[PDB]
UniProtKB/Swiss-Prot annotation:
The gene coding this protein: AIP
Tissues expressing this chain: Widely expressed. Higher levels seen in the heart, placenta and skeletal muscle. Not expressed in the liver.
Keyword flag Repeat: yes
Post-translational modification Phosphoserine, affected residues: S42
Linked pathology: Pituitary adenoma 1, multiple types: A form of pituitary adenoma, a neoplasm of the pituitary gland and one of the most common neuroendocrine tumors. Pituitary adenomas are clinically classified as functional and non-functional tumors, and manifest with a variety of features, including local invasion of surrounding structures and excessive hormone secretion.
Localization annotation: Cytoplasm
Included range, full protein: 2 to 166 of 330
Domain PPIase FKBP-type: start-end pairs: 30-120
Full protein name: AH receptor-interacting protein
Functional note: May play a positive role in AHR-mediated (aromatic hydrocarbon receptor) signaling, possibly by influencing its receptivity for ligand and/or its nuclear targeting. Cellular negative regulator of the hepatitis B virus (HBV) X protein.
Keyword Iron found: no
Keywords annotated in UniProt: Cushing syndrome, Cytoplasm, Phosphoprotein, Repeat, TPR repeat
Species of origin: Homo sapiens
Alphabetical GO biological process terms: protein maturation; protein targeting to mitochondrion; xenobiotic metabolic process
Quaternary structure (record): Interacts with RET in the pituitary gland; this interaction prevents the formation of the AIP-survivin complex.
Amino acid sequence: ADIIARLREDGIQKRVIQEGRGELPDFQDGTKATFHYRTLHSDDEGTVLDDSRARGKPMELIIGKKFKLPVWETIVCTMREGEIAQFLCDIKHVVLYPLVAKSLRNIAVGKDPLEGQRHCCGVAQMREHSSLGHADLDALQQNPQPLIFHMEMLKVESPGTYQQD
């Protein structure tokens, strides 16, 4: 119906930079929204904690079925194929963002932890010790802050057309 009018009364406040192209799809339980993300601090420091379009490697959010963090889904429900929007969300919604950051990296290897314990998708020939224990997103665990999420929409598919190979 009107998604810009429900976001302003949700606690959050949205802003689009470039209005994209085409028709706005369903955004319901089982939609594959593929986009970039750049999380930086709003007015406490101005520091960038995470940056995906900086290297050119896009993320993937499942609407309300696989994915744990629901504020990424309410951010992208207003956004269409090719639309770019940057905006703050209140700490009541991004409280479990530093907990799901330890699974949108790790569980995203290939469906569940023990289920796909294997690099067979696109990770081959890299000798590096990773070692989990952040200070950029663990700054919220000592002092939680409402962050700027710069999302960049590229493609989004509905339950029926989307499939993994």
